[PDB]
Subunit: 146 residues, 2 copies
């Protein structure tokens, strides 16, 4: 139809109270505006383009079933490519509503997304478990995990 | 009903590789019976605001493009490739990759890592703070030797 959908996520199950927070924020935003809403969520990183409920959302939007996507803040939706996403969303007739533009993003996802990304580049630069791979990854790891 | 080739390198010093990409794309299309137009940028695959990349995405959203031909996936974008490919599909647009296994240029890896580390460091600790400068400089020292 012209559905209104909320999307929430966190990377780790340990952040589940925060997830339930995002959900309540979105849920009462909808209720303030008198909107029926279906809410979708993942527990998984914003680097993961294969998030199950996220991909469900994407498919609804690309099939022109969605009027508005409501999120607490941008990096909940995806870590990279938000602007590309926003443009493609408009082309289907879909707005992204950001409730809390400036909201402080959870520090542990910044740490763990960075570690994931450094590993990926270190692998390509030097080869998995090579001397330079170990050096770079464990150095970055030491700085951010303390 | 249009086939676009897209070529990208990050720096001016790589202009010779950019032209190599273009001849690869051009000869691929001629061999296979395809009429083609070339779009090209000098800029990082991390940069969502590259001029011709933006132009290409608009052309796809306007249903002008049947196929996009690239040398290898990270020419088009560093991240979000699979999501982008599905957006393309929704508009009738196939991505043709010429050399799937091709080795990506080392220096783009070096500098894209530096860029990513700087974004995350800035989010972690604040731009130009002490921990910021520690993290970014420690990474810089390692990857640039």
């Amino acid at each position: 139809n012209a559905k209104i959908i909320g999307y929430a996520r966190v990377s780790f199950n340990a952040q589940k109270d925060d997830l339930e927070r995002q959900i309540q924020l979105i849920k009462s935003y909808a209720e303030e505006n008198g909107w029926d809403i279906q809410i979708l969520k993942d527990i998984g990183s914003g680097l993961n383009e294969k998030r199950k409920n996220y991909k469900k959302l994407l498919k609804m939007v690309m099939n022109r079933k969605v009027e508005k996507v409501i999120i607490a803040y941008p990096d909940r939706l995806t870590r990279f490519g938000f602007e590309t996403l926003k443009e493609f969303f408009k082309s289907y007739g879909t707005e992204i509503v950001i409730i809390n533009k400036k909201h402080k993003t959870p520090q542990e996802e910044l740490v763990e997304d960075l570690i994931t990304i450094v590993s990926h580049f270190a692998g390509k630069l030097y080869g998995m478990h090579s001397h330079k791979y170990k050096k770079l990854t464990k150095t970055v790891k030491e700085i951010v995990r303390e």
